[PDB]
Amino acid sequence: MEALVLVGHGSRLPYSKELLVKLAEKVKERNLFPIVEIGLMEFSEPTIPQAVKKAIEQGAKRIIVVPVFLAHGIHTTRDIPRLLGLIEIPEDVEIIYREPIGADDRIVDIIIDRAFGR
Amino acid sequence: MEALVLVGHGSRLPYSKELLVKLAEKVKERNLFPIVEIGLMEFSEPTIPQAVKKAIEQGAKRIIVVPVFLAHGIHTTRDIPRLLGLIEEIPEDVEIIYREPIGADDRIVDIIIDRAFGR
């Protein structure tokens, strides 16, 4: 009934899509969402519209879109809301555009681990 | 003796610099590093070279540079190692330690779930 769509920037190197794929597999492992799809803004496939369509066609009517980005900017405030036509979705279907990662204490934790090469 | 330099992409909007600044202040609060500076790759100030020089001139000789980026890509593997002159302004008697980005860390999964639920 609802789907998680994880959305990422995309890269000409493979690292970005690998990351979204690992994140989606990890979230799949927690069994919270019936459907979990990934989309990339530029360069790679699947694209954000493709991810959304895949979710709809598995029978979701509430699409939770989470931008896997550190901060807001052009991509999160313009391009993505655009691609989601929030500015090809049925009536019976709502897109719920969520919030990026931001300055979360857990990323402070992650940064200190990285500082120490852990 | 060692300094943490947090390095971020930079943006034409202000959100990116705000985030690095909040991150640096939060790290400052944990009292682990004598010196903590931030640098932005494009658009904003301070710049990566500026952040590094500020760290050196406060008397650090090992600079820990952490790229606050989700994944590797052009910025983390080319531009930044370049700006740090780790590839191809830094004196001797000082080493840059270029660390690893955030990657697919379990804590990011936790954060994504929170975001999914509008927390």
Side-chain angles (χ1 to χ4, degrees), chain A residues 30-77:
Chain A
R30 331 267 279 239
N31 322 129
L32 297 175
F33 302 90
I35 302 167
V36 172
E37 224 61 67
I38 68 154
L40 296 140
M41 190 195 59
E42 287 169 353
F43 311 110
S44 322
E45 263 185 355
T47 63
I48 294 166
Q50 296 179 313
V52 170
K53 186 90 247 185
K54 272 187 70 158
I56 296 170
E57 90 195 356
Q58 298 178 67
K61 280 129 214 215
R62 211 151 151 283
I63 292 81
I64 317 320
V65 181
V66 173
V68 181
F69 283 66
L70 295 164
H72 276 292
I74 317 280
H75 297 297
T76 75
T77 59

mmCIF file of all heavy atoms in Angstrom, chain A residues 30-77:
data_model
loop_
_atom_site.group_PDB
_atom_site.id
_atom_site.type_symbol
_atom_site.label_atom_id
_atom_site.label_comp_id
_atom_site.label_asym_id
_atom_site.label_seq_id
_atom_site.Cartn_x
_atom_site.Cartn_y
_atom_site.Cartn_z
ATOM 1 N N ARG A 30 15.339 -4.951 6.926
ATOM 2 C CA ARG A 30 14.667 -4.608 8.177
ATOM 3 C C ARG A 30 13.162 -4.923 8.125
ATOM 4 O O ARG A 30 12.497 -4.753 9.149
ATOM 5 C CB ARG A 30 14.872 -3.128 8.530
ATOM 6 C CG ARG A 30 16.168 -2.521 8.017
ATOM 7 C CD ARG A 30 17.324 -2.570 8.970
ATOM 8 N NE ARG A 30 17.145 -1.477 9.890
ATOM 9 C CZ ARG A 30 18.033 -0.492 10.055
ATOM 10 N NH1 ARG A 30 19.241 -0.511 9.446
ATOM 11 N NH2 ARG A 30 17.802 0.427 10.995
ATOM 12 N N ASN A 31 12.621 -5.330 6.948
ATOM 13 C CA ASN A 31 11.204 -5.599 6.715
ATOM 14 C C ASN A 31 10.289 -4.536 7.333
ATOM 15 O O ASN A 31 9.524 -4.860 8.240
ATOM 16 C CB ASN A 31 10.719 -6.917 7.337
ATOM 17 C CG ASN A 31 11.718 -8.055 7.259
ATOM 18 O OD1 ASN A 31 11.999 -8.689 8.271
ATOM 19 N ND2 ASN A 31 12.300 -8.271 6.090
ATOM 20 N N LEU A 32 10.329 -3.294 6.828
ATOM 21 C CA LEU A 32 9.403 -2.263 7.280
ATOM 22 C C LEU A 32 8.421 -1.843 6.169
ATOM 23 O O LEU A 32 7.347 -1.254 6.427
ATOM 24 C CB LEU A 32 10.219 -1.056 7.741
ATOM 25 C CG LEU A 32 11.149 -1.273 8.924
ATOM 26 C CD1 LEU A 32 11.946 -0.014 9.158
ATOM 27 C CD2 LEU A 32 10.377 -1.583 10.179
ATOM 28 N N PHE A 33 8.831 -2.082 4.915
ATOM 29 C CA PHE A 33 8.125 -1.551 3.763
ATOM 30 C C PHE A 33 7.888 -2.710 2.819
ATOM 31 O O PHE A 33 8.746 -3.553 2.612
ATOM 32 C CB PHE A 33 8.904 -0.425 3.081
ATOM 33 C CG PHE A 33 9.212 0.717 4.012
ATOM 34 C CD1 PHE A 33 10.384 0.733 4.758
ATOM 35 C CD2 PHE A 33 8.318 1.754 4.197
ATOM 36 C CE1 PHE A 33 10.687 1.774 5.628
ATOM 37 C CE2 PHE A 33 8.626 2.815 5.050
ATOM 38 C CZ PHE A 33 9.800 2.815 5.778
ATOM 39 N N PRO A 34 6.662 -2.798 2.299
ATOM 40 C CA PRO A 34 6.279 -3.859 1.372
ATOM 41 C C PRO A 34 7.062 -3.793 0.057
ATOM 42 O O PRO A 34 7.421 -4.838 -0.491
ATOM 43 C CB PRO A 34 4.759 -3.598 1.231
ATOM 44 C CG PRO A 34 4.591 -2.115 1.569
ATOM 45 C CD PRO A 34 5.558 -1.919 2.715
ATOM 46 N N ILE A 35 7.316 -2.563 -0.440
ATOM 47 C CA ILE A 35 7.987 -2.251 -1.688
ATOM 48 C C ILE A 35 9.086 -1.239 -1.378
ATOM 49 O O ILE A 35 8.833 -0.284 -0.663
ATOM 50 C CB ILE A 35 6.927 -1.602 -2.588
ATOM 51 C CG1 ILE A 35 5.747 -2.547 -2.790
ATOM 52 C CG2 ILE A 35 7.495 -1.017 -3.890
ATOM 53 C CD1 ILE A 35 4.563 -1.818 -3.398
ATOM 54 N N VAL A 36 10.271 -1.437 -1.961
ATOM 55 C CA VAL A 36 11.416 -0.560 -1.784
ATOM 56 C C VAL A 36 12.142 -0.445 -3.117
ATOM 57 O O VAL A 36 12.700 -1.414 -3.597
ATOM 58 C CB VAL A 36 12.428 -1.157 -0.802
ATOM 59 C CG1 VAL A 36 13.691 -0.311 -0.797
ATOM 60 C CG2 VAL A 36 11.851 -1.316 0.582
ATOM 61 N N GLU A 37 12.192 0.759 -3.678
ATOM 62 C CA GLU A 37 12.787 0.980 -4.980
ATOM 63 C C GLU A 37 13.837 2.094 -4.888
ATOM 64 O O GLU A 37 13.835 2.901 -3.948
ATOM 65 C CB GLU A 37 11.637 1.335 -5.907
ATOM 66 C CG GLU A 37 11.703 0.638 -7.239
ATOM 67 C CD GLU A 37 11.652 -0.852 -7.045
ATOM 68 O OE1 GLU A 37 10.613 -1.317 -6.618
ATOM 69 O OE2 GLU A 37 12.672 -1.508 -7.266
ATOM 70 N N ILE A 38 14.764 2.122 -5.849
ATOM 71 C CA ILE A 38 15.763 3.186 -5.869
ATOM 72 C C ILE A 38 15.722 3.922 -7.206
ATOM 73 O O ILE A 38 15.347 3.348 -8.216
ATOM 74 C CB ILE A 38 17.177 2.682 -5.574
ATOM 75 C CG1 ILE A 38 17.664 1.796 -6.724
ATOM 76 C CG2 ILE A 38 17.248 2.026 -4.195
ATOM 77 C CD1 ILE A 38 19.174 1.760 -6.873
ATOM 78 N N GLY A 39 16.088 5.204 -7.190
ATOM 79 C CA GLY A 39 16.151 6.026 -8.386
ATOM 80 C C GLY A 39 17.321 6.997 -8.287
ATOM 81 O O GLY A 39 17.708 7.427 -7.203
ATOM 82 N N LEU A 40 17.889 7.326 -9.436
ATOM 83 C CA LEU A 40 19.018 8.244 -9.481
ATOM 84 C C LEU A 40 18.670 9.416 -10.379
ATOM 85 O O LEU A 40 17.989 9.249 -11.402
ATOM 86 C CB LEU A 40 20.247 7.483 -9.964
ATOM 87 C CG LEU A 40 20.623 6.394 -8.981
ATOM 88 C CD1 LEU A 40 21.062 5.139 -9.688
ATOM 89 C CD2 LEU A 40 21.690 6.923 -8.057
ATOM 90 N N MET A 41 19.112 10.595 -9.935
ATOM 91 C CA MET A 41 18.706 11.822 -10.581
ATOM 92 C C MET A 41 19.354 11.928 -11.965
ATOM 93 O O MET A 41 18.633 12.039 -12.939
ATOM 94 C CB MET A 41 19.011 13.011 -9.680
ATOM 95 C CG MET A 41 18.411 14.294 -10.154
ATOM 96 S SD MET A 41 19.186 15.700 -9.300
ATOM 97 C CE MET A 41 20.912 15.503 -9.734
ATOM 98 N N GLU A 42 20.683 11.795 -12.072
ATOM 99 C CA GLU A 42 21.379 11.878 -13.351
ATOM 100 C C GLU A 42 22.213 10.617 -13.607
ATOM 101 O O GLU A 42 22.481 9.843 -12.694
ATOM 102 C CB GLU A 42 22.295 13.098 -13.352
ATOM 103 C CG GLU A 42 21.615 14.449 -13.466
ATOM 104 C CD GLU A 42 22.534 15.647 -13.202
ATOM 105 O OE1 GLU A 42 23.696 15.439 -12.784
ATOM 106 O OE2 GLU A 42 22.091 16.810 -13.400
ATOM 107 N N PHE A 43 22.618 10.420 -14.867
ATOM 108 C CA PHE A 43 23.636 9.480 -15.322
ATOM 109 C C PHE A 43 23.224 8.016 -15.263
ATOM 110 O O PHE A 43 23.630 7.258 -16.118
ATOM 111 C CB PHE A 43 24.982 9.625 -14.609
ATOM 112 C CG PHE A 43 25.456 11.045 -14.559
ATOM 113 C CD1 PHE A 43 25.486 11.730 -13.354
ATOM 114 C CD2 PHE A 43 25.791 11.715 -15.727
ATOM 115 C CE1 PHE A 43 25.895 13.049 -13.297
ATOM 116 C CE2 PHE A 43 26.156 13.048 -15.688
ATOM 117 C CZ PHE A 43 26.222 13.703 -14.471
ATOM 118 N N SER A 44 22.565 7.570 -14.203
ATOM 119 C CA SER A 44 22.443 6.130 -14.039
ATOM 120 C C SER A 44 20.976 5.755 -14.215
ATOM 121 O O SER A 44 20.113 6.622 -14.299
ATOM 122 C CB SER A 44 23.008 5.635 -12.703
ATOM 123 O OG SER A 44 24.192 6.323 -12.285
ATOM 124 N N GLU A 45 20.714 4.447 -14.290
ATOM 125 C CA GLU A 45 19.379 3.888 -14.204
ATOM 126 C C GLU A 45 19.308 2.930 -13.026
ATOM 127 O O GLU A 45 20.355 2.411 -12.627
ATOM 128 C CB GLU A 45 19.070 3.100 -15.451
ATOM 129 C CG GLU A 45 18.291 3.941 -16.433
ATOM 130 C CD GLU A 45 17.858 3.152 -17.647
ATOM 131 O OE1 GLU A 45 18.271 1.965 -17.737
ATOM 132 O OE2 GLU A 45 17.128 3.724 -18.486
ATOM 133 N N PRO A 46 18.140 2.753 -12.353
ATOM 134 C CA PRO A 46 16.883 3.425 -12.705
ATOM 135 C C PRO A 46 16.798 4.920 -12.382
ATOM 136 O O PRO A 46 17.461 5.396 -11.454
ATOM 137 C CB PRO A 46 15.902 2.824 -11.687
ATOM 138 C CG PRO A 46 16.559 1.551 -11.209
ATOM 139 C CD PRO A 46 18.012 1.952 -11.121
ATOM 140 N N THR A 47 15.947 5.632 -13.137
ATOM 141 C CA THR A 47 15.760 7.063 -12.972
ATOM 142 C C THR A 47 14.650 7.272 -11.957
ATOM 143 O O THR A 47 13.937 6.332 -11.617
ATOM 144 C CB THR A 47 15.386 7.758 -14.290
ATOM 145 O OG1 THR A 47 14.123 7.281 -14.772
ATOM 146 C CG2 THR A 47 16.450 7.611 -15.355
ATOM 147 N N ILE A 48 14.507 8.500 -11.454
ATOM 148 C CA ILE A 48 13.496 8.725 -10.437
ATOM 149 C C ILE A 48 12.110 8.377 -10.987
ATOM 150 O O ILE A 48 11.368 7.605 -10.381
ATOM 151 C CB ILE A 48 13.606 10.124 -9.831
ATOM 152 C CG1 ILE A 48 14.913 10.228 -9.058
ATOM 153 C CG2 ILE A 48 12.458 10.368 -8.905
ATOM 154 C CD1 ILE A 48 15.283 11.654 -8.692
ATOM 155 N N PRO A 49 11.689 8.876 -12.159
ATOM 156 C CA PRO A 49 10.392 8.471 -12.694
ATOM 157 C C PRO A 49 10.244 6.955 -12.840
ATOM 158 O O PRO A 49 9.232 6.382 -12.463
ATOM 159 C CB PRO A 49 10.280 9.269 -13.998
ATOM 160 C CG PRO A 49 11.688 9.706 -14.329
ATOM 161 C CD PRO A 49 12.365 9.886 -12.992
ATOM 162 N N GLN A 50 11.274 6.286 -13.342
ATOM 163 C CA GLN A 50 11.237 4.831 -13.429
ATOM 164 C C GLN A 50 11.006 4.148 -12.071
ATOM 165 O O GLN A 50 10.285 3.145 -11.999
ATOM 166 C CB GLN A 50 12.544 4.324 -14.025
ATOM 167 C CG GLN A 50 12.782 4.779 -15.458
ATOM 168 C CD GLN A 50 14.108 4.216 -15.901
ATOM 169 O OE1 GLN A 50 15.108 4.302 -15.186
ATOM 170 N NE2 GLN A 50 14.127 3.599 -17.066
ATOM 171 N N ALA A 51 11.651 4.651 -10.997
ATOM 172 C CA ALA A 51 11.523 4.035 -9.681
ATOM 173 C C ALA A 51 10.092 4.208 -9.183
ATOM 174 O O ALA A 51 9.476 3.276 -8.666
ATOM 175 C CB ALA A 51 12.511 4.619 -8.711
ATOM 176 N N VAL A 52 9.563 5.420 -9.383
ATOM 177 C CA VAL A 52 8.195 5.725 -8.986
ATOM 178 C C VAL A 52 7.207 4.844 -9.751
ATOM 179 O O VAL A 52 6.291 4.298 -9.149
ATOM 180 C CB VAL A 52 7.851 7.207 -9.186
ATOM 181 C CG1 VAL A 52 6.361 7.380 -8.988
ATOM 182 C CG2 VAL A 52 8.645 8.089 -8.237
ATOM 183 N N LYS A 53 7.391 4.695 -11.072
ATOM 184 C CA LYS A 53 6.466 3.871 -11.825
ATOM 185 C C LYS A 53 6.521 2.407 -11.360
ATOM 186 O O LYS A 53 5.499 1.742 -11.225
ATOM 187 C CB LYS A 53 6.547 4.198 -13.320
ATOM 188 C CG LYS A 53 5.507 3.499 -14.211
ATOM 189 C CD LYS A 53 4.124 4.183 -14.476
ATOM 190 C CE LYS A 53 2.902 3.493 -13.876
ATOM 191 N NZ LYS A 53 1.622 4.127 -14.278
ATOM 192 N N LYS A 54 7.719 1.901 -11.085
ATOM 193 C CA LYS A 54 7.879 0.541 -10.619
ATOM 194 C C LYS A 54 7.094 0.371 -9.329
ATOM 195 O O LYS A 54 6.460 -0.653 -9.127
ATOM 196 C CB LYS A 54 9.345 0.216 -10.325
ATOM 197 C CG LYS A 54 10.176 -0.299 -11.488
ATOM 198 C CD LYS A 54 11.545 -0.749 -11.060
ATOM 199 C CE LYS A 54 11.457 -2.018 -10.232
ATOM 200 N NZ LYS A 54 12.737 -2.767 -10.238
ATOM 201 N N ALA A 55 7.160 1.364 -8.437
ATOM 202 C CA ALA A 55 6.464 1.266 -7.163
ATOM 203 C C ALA A 55 4.952 1.251 -7.387
ATOM 204 O O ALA A 55 4.252 0.404 -6.835
ATOM 205 C CB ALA A 55 6.870 2.391 -6.251
ATOM 206 N N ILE A 56 4.445 2.172 -8.222
ATOM 207 C CA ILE A 56 3.020 2.215 -8.511
ATOM 208 C C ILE A 56 2.547 0.872 -9.053
ATOM 209 O O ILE A 56 1.516 0.368 -8.608
ATOM 210 C CB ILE A 56 2.672 3.336 -9.493
ATOM 211 C CG1 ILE A 56 2.980 4.695 -8.873
ATOM 212 C CG2 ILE A 56 1.209 3.237 -9.887
ATOM 213 C CD1 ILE A 56 2.896 5.837 -9.850
ATOM 214 N N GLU A 57 3.295 0.317 -10.013
ATOM 215 C CA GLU A 57 2.854 -0.894 -10.684
ATOM 216 C C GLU A 57 3.027 -2.153 -9.813
ATOM 217 O O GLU A 57 2.702 -3.247 -10.268
ATOM 218 C CB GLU A 57 3.482 -0.985 -12.075
ATOM 219 C CG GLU A 57 4.827 -1.710 -12.095
ATOM 220 C CD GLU A 57 5.737 -1.596 -13.320
ATOM 221 O OE1 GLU A 57 5.327 -0.958 -14.337
ATOM 222 O OE2 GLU A 57 6.884 -2.130 -13.247
ATOM 223 N N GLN A 58 3.555 -2.031 -8.582
ATOM 224 C CA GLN A 58 3.564 -3.166 -7.662
ATOM 225 C C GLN A 58 2.400 -3.050 -6.669
ATOM 226 O O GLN A 58 2.252 -3.881 -5.761
ATOM 227 C CB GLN A 58 4.886 -3.264 -6.912
ATOM 228 C CG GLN A 58 6.053 -3.484 -7.850
ATOM 229 C CD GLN A 58 7.372 -3.545 -7.126
ATOM 230 O OE1 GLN A 58 7.651 -4.454 -6.370
ATOM 231 N NE2 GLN A 58 8.227 -2.572 -7.363
ATOM 232 N N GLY A 59 1.585 -2.000 -6.876
ATOM 233 C CA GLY A 59 0.357 -1.734 -6.153
ATOM 234 C C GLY A 59 0.583 -0.879 -4.913
ATOM 235 O O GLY A 59 0.150 -1.256 -3.825
ATOM 236 N N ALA A 60 1.275 0.255 -5.075
ATOM 237 C CA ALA A 60 1.397 1.230 -4.008
ATOM 238 C C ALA A 60 0.607 2.459 -4.420
ATOM 239 O O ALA A 60 0.566 2.780 -5.606
ATOM 240 C CB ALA A 60 2.845 1.569 -3.802
ATOM 241 N N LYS A 61 0.009 3.138 -3.436
ATOM 242 C CA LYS A 61 -0.734 4.362 -3.689
ATOM 243 C C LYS A 61 -0.198 5.490 -2.814
ATOM 244 O O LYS A 61 -0.579 6.653 -2.964
ATOM 245 C CB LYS A 61 -2.225 4.078 -3.485
ATOM 246 C CG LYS A 61 -2.829 3.389 -4.702
ATOM 247 C CD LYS A 61 -3.616 2.133 -4.478
ATOM 248 C CE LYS A 61 -3.425 1.173 -5.639
ATOM 249 N NZ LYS A 61 -4.643 0.385 -5.940
ATOM 250 N N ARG A 62 0.680 5.126 -1.873
ATOM 251 C CA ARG A 62 1.383 6.151 -1.132
ATOM 252 C C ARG A 62 2.887 5.976 -1.310
ATOM 253 O O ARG A 62 3.465 4.998 -0.798
ATOM 254 C CB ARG A 62 1.005 5.940 0.320
ATOM 255 C CG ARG A 62 1.008 7.240 1.085
ATOM 256 C CD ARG A 62 0.012 7.171 2.222
ATOM 257 N NE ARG A 62 0.615 8.076 3.178
ATOM 258 C CZ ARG A 62 1.663 7.741 3.928
ATOM 259 N NH1 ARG A 62 2.167 6.509 3.821
ATOM 260 N NH2 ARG A 62 2.180 8.631 4.773
ATOM 261 N N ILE A 63 3.502 6.897 -2.065
ATOM 262 C CA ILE A 63 4.921 6.751 -2.373
ATOM 263 C C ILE A 63 5.713 7.689 -1.458
ATOM 264 O O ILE A 63 5.564 8.919 -1.566
ATOM 265 C CB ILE A 63 5.230 6.948 -3.875
ATOM 266 C CG1 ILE A 63 4.656 5.816 -4.724
ATOM 267 C CG2 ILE A 63 6.719 6.978 -4.086
ATOM 268 C CD1 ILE A 63 3.220 5.949 -5.040
ATOM 269 N N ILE A 64 6.498 7.085 -0.535
ATOM 270 C CA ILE A 64 7.427 7.823 0.311
ATOM 271 C C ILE A 64 8.737 7.971 -0.460
ATOM 272 O O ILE A 64 9.436 6.966 -0.688
ATOM 273 C CB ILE A 64 7.711 7.110 1.646
ATOM 274 C CG1 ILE A 64 6.462 6.530 2.315
ATOM 275 C CG2 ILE A 64 8.466 8.046 2.570
ATOM 276 C CD1 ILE A 64 5.293 7.462 2.173
ATOM 277 N N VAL A 65 9.063 9.217 -0.840
ATOM 278 C CA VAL A 65 10.333 9.485 -1.511
ATOM 279 C C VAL A 65 11.329 10.119 -0.528
ATOM 280 O O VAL A 65 11.153 11.252 -0.076
ATOM 281 C CB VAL A 65 10.108 10.391 -2.740
ATOM 282 C CG1 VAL A 65 11.393 10.669 -3.477
ATOM 283 C CG2 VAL A 65 9.034 9.856 -3.674
ATOM 284 N N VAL A 66 12.393 9.386 -0.210
ATOM 285 C CA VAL A 66 13.437 9.958 0.633
ATOM 286 C C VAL A 66 14.670 10.339 -0.189
ATOM 287 O O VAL A 66 15.291 9.492 -0.840
ATOM 288 C CB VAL A 66 13.823 8.948 1.720
ATOM 289 C CG1 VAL A 66 15.011 9.396 2.524
ATOM 290 C CG2 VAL A 66 12.632 8.685 2.619
ATOM 291 N N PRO A 67 15.080 11.630 -0.175
ATOM 292 C CA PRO A 67 16.299 12.060 -0.862
ATOM 293 C C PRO A 67 17.531 11.722 -0.024
ATOM 294 O O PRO A 67 17.762 12.256 1.053
ATOM 295 C CB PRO A 67 16.066 13.580 -0.987
ATOM 296 C CG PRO A 67 15.252 13.963 0.234
ATOM 297 C CD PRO A 67 14.358 12.766 0.455
ATOM 298 N N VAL A 68 18.332 10.806 -0.527
ATOM 299 C CA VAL A 68 19.534 10.410 0.166
ATOM 300 C C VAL A 68 20.597 11.409 -0.280
ATOM 301 O O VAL A 68 21.389 11.151 -1.197
ATOM 302 C CB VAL A 68 19.854 8.919 -0.156
ATOM 303 C CG1 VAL A 68 21.103 8.408 0.545
ATOM 304 C CG2 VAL A 68 18.671 7.976 0.150
ATOM 305 N N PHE A 69 20.563 12.573 0.359
ATOM 306 C CA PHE A 69 21.495 13.663 0.084
ATOM 307 C C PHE A 69 21.879 14.226 1.439
ATOM 308 O O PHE A 69 21.049 14.140 2.330
ATOM 309 C CB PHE A 69 20.776 14.807 -0.649
ATOM 310 C CG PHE A 69 20.524 14.582 -2.118
ATOM 311 C CD1 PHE A 69 19.645 13.585 -2.570
ATOM 312 C CD2 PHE A 69 21.209 15.313 -3.081
ATOM 313 C CE1 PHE A 69 19.455 13.320 -3.929
ATOM 314 C CE2 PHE A 69 21.035 15.014 -4.434
ATOM 315 C CZ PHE A 69 20.164 14.028 -4.861
ATOM 316 N N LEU A 70 23.092 14.756 1.619
ATOM 317 C CA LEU A 70 23.406 15.394 2.897
ATOM 318 C C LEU A 70 22.540 16.628 3.169
ATOM 319 O O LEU A 70 21.832 16.691 4.173
ATOM 320 C CB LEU A 70 24.904 15.699 2.977
ATOM 321 C CG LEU A 70 25.736 14.421 2.991
ATOM 322 C CD1 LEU A 70 27.218 14.667 2.691
ATOM 323 C CD2 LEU A 70 25.509 13.656 4.296
ATOM 324 N N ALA A 71 22.535 17.583 2.249
ATOM 325 C CA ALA A 71 21.882 18.860 2.467
ATOM 326 C C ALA A 71 20.854 19.146 1.368
ATOM 327 O O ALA A 71 20.855 18.510 0.315
ATOM 328 C CB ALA A 71 22.911 19.980 2.576
ATOM 329 N N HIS A 72 19.984 20.131 1.635
ATOM 330 C CA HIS A 72 19.145 20.697 0.589
ATOM 331 C C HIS A 72 20.016 21.515 -0.354
ATOM 332 O O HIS A 72 21.050 22.085 0.047
ATOM 333 C CB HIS A 72 18.110 21.670 1.169
ATOM 334 C CG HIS A 72 16.879 21.014 1.677
ATOM 335 N ND1 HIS A 72 15.996 20.396 0.811
ATOM 336 C CD2 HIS A 72 16.395 20.860 2.939
ATOM 337 C CE1 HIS A 72 15.019 19.866 1.523
ATOM 338 N NE2 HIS A 72 15.240 20.136 2.846
ATOM 339 N N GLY A 73 19.537 21.577 -1.596
ATOM 340 C CA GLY A 73 20.058 22.487 -2.602
ATOM 341 C C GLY A 73 19.225 22.403 -3.878
ATOM 342 O O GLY A 73 18.044 22.073 -3.850
ATOM 343 N N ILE A 74 19.853 22.701 -5.008
ATOM 344 C CA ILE A 74 19.161 22.678 -6.283
ATOM 345 C C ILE A 74 18.474 21.325 -6.520
ATOM 346 O O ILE A 74 17.352 21.265 -7.031
ATOM 347 C CB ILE A 74 20.147 23.051 -7.404
ATOM 348 C CG1 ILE A 74 21.056 24.233 -7.027
ATOM 349 C CG2 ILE A 74 19.382 23.306 -8.672
ATOM 350 C CD1 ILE A 74 20.443 25.623 -7.169
ATOM 351 N N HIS A 75 19.148 20.232 -6.159
ATOM 352 C CA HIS A 75 18.629 18.954 -6.575
ATOM 353 C C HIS A 75 17.389 18.641 -5.743
ATOM 354 O O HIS A 75 16.336 18.254 -6.290
ATOM 355 C CB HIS A 75 19.744 17.904 -6.500
ATOM 356 C CG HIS A 75 20.886 18.191 -7.416
ATOM 357 N ND1 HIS A 75 20.766 18.221 -8.798
ATOM 358 C CD2 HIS A 75 22.172 18.480 -7.157
ATOM 359 C CE1 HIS A 75 21.932 18.499 -9.353
ATOM 360 N NE2 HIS A 75 22.813 18.643 -8.369
ATOM 361 N N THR A 76 17.506 18.869 -4.424
ATOM 362 C CA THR A 76 16.412 18.503 -3.546
ATOM 363 C C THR A 76 15.234 19.478 -3.639
ATOM 364 O O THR A 76 14.111 19.069 -3.367
ATOM 365 C CB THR A 76 16.898 18.262 -2.112
ATOM 366 O OG1 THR A 76 17.180 19.498 -1.465
ATOM 367 C CG2 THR A 76 18.152 17.432 -2.078
ATOM 368 N N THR A 77 15.470 20.751 -3.985
ATOM 369 C CA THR A 77 14.386 21.730 -3.927
ATOM 370 C C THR A 77 13.778 22.034 -5.295
ATOM 371 O O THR A 77 12.636 22.471 -5.344
ATOM 372 C CB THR A 77 14.817 23.065 -3.313
ATOM 373 O OG1 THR A 77 15.876 23.568 -4.128
ATOM 374 C CG2 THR A 77 15.237 22.944 -1.870
#
